[PDB]
Design an enzyme around this catalytic site. Structure first.
Site, mmCIF file in Angstrom:
data_model
loop_
_atom_site.group_PDB
_atom_site.id
_atom_site.type_symbol
_atom_site.label_atom_id
_atom_site.label_comp_id
_atom_site.label_asym_id
_atom_site.label_seq_id
_atom_site.Cartn_x
_atom_site.Cartn_y
_atom_site.Cartn_z
ATOM 1 N N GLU A 35 -10.964 -21.828 -8.422
ATOM 2 C CA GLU A 35 -9.769 -22.065 -9.268
ATOM 3 C C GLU A 35 -9.514 -21.058 -9.969
ATOM 4 O OE1 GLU A 35 -7.787 -24.483 -8.582
ATOM 5 O OE2 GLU A 35 -8.940 -25.886 -7.517
ATOM 6 N N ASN A 46 2.803 -24.282 -10.220
ATOM 7 C CA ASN A 46 2.732 -24.952 -8.969
ATOM 8 C C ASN A 46 4.307 -24.876 -8.461
ATOM 9 O OD1 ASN A 46 0.119 -25.621 -8.999
ATOM 10 N ND2 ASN A 46 0.543 -27.241 -10.631
ATOM 11 N N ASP A 48 6.138 -27.554 -7.707
ATOM 12 C CA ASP A 48 7.114 -28.264 -8.330
ATOM 13 C C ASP A 48 7.446 -28.286 -9.812
ATOM 14 O OD1 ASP A 48 4.013 -29.435 -8.026
ATOM 15 O OD2 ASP A 48 4.845 -30.413 -9.975
ATOM 16 N N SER A 50 5.107 -27.850 -12.287
ATOM 17 C CA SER A 50 4.073 -28.190 -13.137
ATOM 18 C C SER A 50 3.440 -26.723 -13.290
ATOM 19 C CB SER A 50 3.176 -29.080 -12.692
ATOM 20 O OG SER A 50 2.754 -29.041 -11.485
ATOM 21 N N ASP A 52 -1.006 -25.000 -13.712
ATOM 22 C CA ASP A 52 -2.436 -25.447 -13.847
ATOM 23 C C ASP A 52 -2.983 -24.393 -14.782
ATOM 24 O OD1 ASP A 52 -2.128 -27.083 -11.665
ATOM 25 O OD2 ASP A 52 -3.379 -25.733 -10.352
ATOM 26 N N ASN A 59 -3.749 -29.608 -14.111
ATOM 27 C CA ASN A 59 -2.279 -29.845 -13.708
ATOM 28 C C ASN A 59 -1.654 -30.563 -14.990
ATOM 29 O OD1 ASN A 59 -0.067 -30.043 -12.501
ATOM 30 N ND2 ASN A 59 -1.076 -30.163 -10.654
#
Ligand SMILES: [Pt+2]
Ligand SMILES: [Pt+2]
Ligand SMILES: [Pt+2]
Ligand SMILES: [Pt+2]
Ligand SMILES: [Pt+2]
Ligand SMILES: [Pt+2]
Ligand SMILES: [Pt+2]
Ligand SMILES: [Pt+2]
Length: 129
Positions: A35, A46, A48, A50, A52, A59
């Protein structure tokens, strides 16, 4: 902070992740490696809108507030910036909630794709625990 492998395993154990919801410590170490590369400061946007955050790439859609993710939830009740600290407490606390929500570690796309069904015990090899 960029943790060493065994250094993160020790910290994760201390904060209650070993066998948490049945997931062995190596599963959590493997998830962090893919990650964030074990970097507490890691952030990635991300598609959309958002973002992380942190060692486990939690998220903003569901879990924390970053002031720029419209119509998202903050189910861990924390600012996303909390997840970037050299202390992993906030990230571990929140991850316990995530992993308990019914989907297990499949919440972490890197876990499902790179760690699940692999020899995860290898991630804690050599480590004092
Ligand atoms: Pt740091
Ligand atoms: Pt250190
Ligand atoms: Pt803790
Ligand atoms: Pt706990
Ligand atoms: Pt700690
Ligand atoms: Pt909590
Ligand atoms: Pt859910
Ligand atoms: Pt132990």
């Amino acid at each position: 902070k960029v943790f060493g492998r065994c250094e993160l395993a020790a910290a994760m154990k201390r904060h209650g992740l070993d066998n948490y919801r049945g997931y062995s410590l190596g599963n959590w170490v493997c998830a962090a490696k893919f990650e964030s590369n074990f970097n507490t400061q890691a952030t990635n946007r991300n598609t959309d809108g958002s973002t992380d955050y942190g060692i486990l790439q939690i998220n903003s859609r569901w879990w924390c507030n970053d002031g720029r993710t419209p119509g998202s939830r903050n189910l861990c009740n924390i600012p996303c910036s909390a997840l970037l600290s050299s202390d992993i407490t906030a990230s571990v606390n929140c991850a316990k909630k995530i992993v308990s929500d019914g989907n297990g570690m499949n919440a972490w796309v890197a876990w499902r794709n790179r760690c699940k069904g692999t020899d995860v015990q290898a991630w804690i090899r050599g480590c004092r625990l």
